[PDB]
Swiss-Prot record, chain B:
Family per similarity comment: Belongs to the outer membrane factor (OMF) (TC 1.B.17) family.
Membrane-topology descriptor: Lipid-anchor
Database matches in PANTHER family: CATION EFFLUX SYSTEM PROTEIN CUSC, OUTER MEMBRANE CATION EFFLUX PROTEIN
InterPro entries found in the cross-reference section: OMF, OMP_efflux, RND_efflux_OM_lipoprot_NodT
GO molecular function: efflux transmembrane transporter activity
Biological role: Component of the sil cation-efflux system that confers resistance to silver. May be part of a three-component cation/proton antiporter.
Lipidated sites in chain (N-palmitoyl cysteine): C1
Organism: Salmonella typhimurium
Name of the molecule in the record: Probable outer membrane lipoprotein SilC
Keyword Membrane: yes
SUPFAM superfamilies: Outer membrane efflux proteins (OEP)
């Protein structure tokens, strides 16, 4: 037996050896997700999400497809019966009757490994479909957690808007009482009435956001049981990934999408092997045991049984270069598989490089926003103080409250961005496949 | 004749029996779309949109594909002629001549329903393609209407921007005359000059928005006639869907995309039946009337005509488990069709749930925004009154006009969102198929 | 030989003959891109981008696919040997042994142009893949330039945020010194402190934007060399497309995506021709030279060689309408190809009509925004002057500095939009194929 396929070489990864930025290990996704709710929802989804269900069925499709293709490599047994009537149109020559029954055993030698390479291309494609399930798995893990964290964000935003509204209602009362007794103008009161109605809208928007974050969580879960409520604890929900000083691009090579591109690349080599076998001769055995007769009474008698054994070898000589062209197709597609591989790596490298950058951008953003917060709370208290003594008009109170609301909302969105980014680093690195080191 | 395909069972829908939230009926899209312009554009688009045309062609593809596959079930007739020359290379054996003409009639019995099941898979796939057209149809309706409503929004936003601009020019005058006569500061006047130039920029943005809304409305129409102008009447353009107290998820099951997933699920059962037939024997008839000769002179003479009749039965015995694996493939793919069905349902249920919630979220937003509006108009008149008497600086007028503009634009965007949401509920329920 | 395929007619383009709005010419993308950096990065990308690499390999696939299909039109030569054993089960008939070797030359006539039309459909489909490469090429140009320009925007936004921050620190100093000596209140000082910390946040956000614009620029280049820094000069980086008074829709018809739809429309005609050939007879020649024997000793001897020559003609008569249904499928898919063609045109026409609109929308936006800028700078100076004399409170300075920062950022975003829009017009018209 011969395999004409080429030896596998892994293409060199077309990315820097390092990200810009002791050893990175995959501690399970149980370490990463500190919050026990996201642990429970992942567990729930892992058994009910329809997309992961399709991904597993696709692995099964590919295993069955390998067994369909591998069957060709094995001997084959078939039986057939038949009557043959035969006469002339004018001549009185009586009409014949030929009864026949047969058992035939076919077998392709495959001395140059055409069928053997085609089964291997399908073996490799099954490995590809397995890594594809894994990629679907860790992306599921990502969507579930982000969906939960997004729901929580809706819970906070709704809650602080309710709280602002009660704050602005007290402001209106503060202004109301000084107008019953002539200290202020009525412009302050209409400014305070504005804020109340404005904030009322916001609460309506945030309720809608919360409704929609619930429905999206339940879609990804695949089950519709009671959605989680708001957590009373804030902070520490995620344990970020610890990265060594100089980190290697090689980490990307174990990603599921890249591994899946690697297995398809292997499958394309095997197809090159089958393309090349197409040039060489083929050897086919075909042995048979038949029994023919002229009346049905003696079909399975002694003088009728016959055996047969035919080895055959066929060779191609001139096909107007069909075999060439089909070899070029193979080799071109293989180069396509190389390109596809490179593409999966280069994007992989971008993604990670981005989240690393975002890690620092978002930290500094969030800390400087808290500082702007603290300064805004002092501004607001001073503005209320000086307005209560007639030193400044109420627009200074309005501005501070406004700025303060915007900043509280942005800080909430920021820590969200922060921990989703952290999830995104986890996932781009190989993600939530393993759950226990 | 036997059919090995399985009996159809509809998969139980993996969603709550009810949405959270007398009987819902599909009154035609003529009742839903109150505005007669959206009705007239829908008519134009129903006869000119290329995507709908492609969807209908895809239905015809599928009917032709069924006829190609059904042909195998019928007897087949073919003729063939031929001369055969035959001689030896060294041995003096005079070169022979065999003239032949023949007429053959082939016919697969299909006793176990292999070909019959494969034609049925293609029947089912044609029904699928019909539900697909329908889905493209109602989605066209949704895109046309939102496209028109979006244009109209662009018209309003542009118009009130122009109106604001004339307002702020008058403000500039109000301040300008008090500076010619020394009552105010020049800081007011640069603040008013500022607003004017700002608003001038906004008008440019909104004109751009109107231009692009026009082009998108003509793309979706597929005809490039005169686009609709702005409506003088505002309100009542849509008659929302009236929904019963407790509403059933079952409504989703008549959605085109879900029905299309169902027909494909039927087609996969048929393929399971063909997979199974592959194990059992096949019986093939093949009768023939030929005529051979050794000189062309007597090809169609009396002593040459011959007839033939060969029934044949072939059986598989050991294929190294190819038939098994091909059956596993069928069953696996069938489960894939079940999963695909469940996915279309779960999504559909999410969508509807979202618009129901959005229905309440958008009404309450819009009403509280109008109340902020009203309060802002009082604030502006009071800031303008107190500024004219030296009680507050002009920054209080600036803020009021600013907040007022912003709120007017949000209210415009809100009612848009409101009525597009309503369109979205219509469509997610079964939508603009019927107009009766 | 006969071709049953139909004559090609180009479908009339279903769009206005004119865009609403001397002669347009495609000056190379070297004229359009004034900035030498974008020219140099395009060169680097044209030799390293993986997507253009894949588009090329797809053209090679298509040519190979044509040679696979074209082989059927030529005579074919094949050889085969074989031994045949033959015996009875119970009858004492000695077991036979028949040795054979053979050389067969097969040839399909194709009198009605079935194989010929099917090769032609694949010729057309290779032309299609060529136009697809071209589309991928000009889209590569568009992505490379917008990536660079986007990077530059990140650079400016970061820089003016750093500069605003030094400004607001000087404001804080200005306020600090009047509170050390009692002239003002402490509300001004906490207002200025706020602006400082706020702007500190913004700087953090702009640094993150810059990093991400670098990584996306390196992805599209396909090489990871030192990214370009900020340009000290601003302005004149692009030379817009000069457009004649009344411009014709016909310009669209040379777009790659539409040409690719056209070639596929041609390929569907050829398939109609093969569908119709299916009805007519087929004529096949098959000549042979074989040599058989009964013992291997004399396999290639004198009495064994035999020659052969069999012309055959096969006719379909009743196929339960398979050939008809296969013809309808062809014709239907051809109408599909027409519709696909129309769709590619109508979208092309929308796109161009949009960038033309946007050309005017963005120029006016940007011009009025500069005027608002100028007016805001006067407002700020006046607010600071009247605050320093006790005439207005500091909030008036706050507002002006705020309004001014927002307007500086929007003007930056605007000229960006302006020159990307211009790139988008170039590309929608045929774009960066020629230099």
């Amino acid at each position: 037996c011969v395999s004409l396929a080429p030896e596998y070489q892994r293409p060199p990864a077309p990315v820097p050896q390092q990200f810009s930025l002791n050893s990175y290990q995959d501690t399970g996704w149980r370490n990463f997700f500190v919050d026990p709710q996201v642990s429970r929802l992942i567990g729930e989804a892992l058994n009910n999400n329809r997309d992961l269900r399709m991904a597993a069925l696709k692995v099964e499709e590919a295993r069955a497809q390998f067994n369909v293709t591998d069957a060709d490599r094995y001997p084959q047994l078939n039986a057939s019966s038949g009557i043959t009537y035969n006469g002339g149109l004018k001549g009185d020559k009586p009409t014949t009757q030929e009864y026949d029954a047969g058992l035939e055993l076919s077998y392709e030698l495959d001395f140059f490994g055409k069928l053997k390479n085609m089964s291997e291309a399908d073996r490799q494609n099954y490995f590809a479909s397995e890594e594809a399930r894994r990629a679907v798995h860790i992306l599921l893990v990502s969507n579930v957690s982000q969906s939960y964290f997004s729901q929580q964000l809706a819970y906070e935003q709704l809650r602080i808007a309710r709280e602002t509204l009660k704050n602005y209602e007290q402001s209106y009362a503060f202004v109301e009482q000084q107008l019953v007794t002539g200290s202020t103008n009525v412009l302050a009161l209409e400014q305070a009435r504005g804020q109340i109605e404005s904030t009322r809208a916001e609460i309506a928007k945030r309720e809608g956001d919360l409704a929609q974050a619930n429905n999206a969580l339940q879609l990804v879960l695949g089950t519709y049981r009671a959605v989680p409520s708001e957590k009373g604890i804030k902070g520490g929900e995620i344990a970020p990934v610890k990265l060594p000083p100089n980190l290697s691009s090689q980490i990307l090579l174990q990603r599921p999408d890249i591994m899946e591109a690697e297995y398809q690349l292997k499958a394309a080599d095997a197809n090159i092997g089958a393309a090349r076998a197409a040039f060489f001769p083929s050897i086919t055995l075909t042995s048979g045991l038949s029994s023919s007769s002229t009346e049905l009474s003696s079909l399975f008698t002694s003088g009728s049984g016959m055996w047969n054994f035919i080895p055959k070898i066929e060779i191609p000589i001139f096909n107007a270069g069909r075999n060439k062209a089909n070899l070029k197709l193979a080799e071109i597609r293989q180069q396509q598989s190389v390109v596809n591989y490179e593409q999966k790596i280069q994007s992989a490298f971008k993604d990670v490089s981005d989240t690393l950058a975002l890690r620092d951008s978002l930290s500094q953003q969030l800390e400087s926003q808290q500082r702007y917060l603290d300064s805004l709370q002092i501004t607001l208290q001073r503005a209320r103080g000086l307005y209560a003594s007639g030193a400044v008009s109420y627009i200074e109170v309005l501005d501070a409250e406004r700025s303060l609301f915007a900043t509280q909302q942005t800080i909430l969105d920021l820590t969200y961005s922060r921990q989703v980014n952290e999830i995104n680093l986890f996932t781009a690195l190989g993600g939530g496949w393993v759950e226990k080191h």
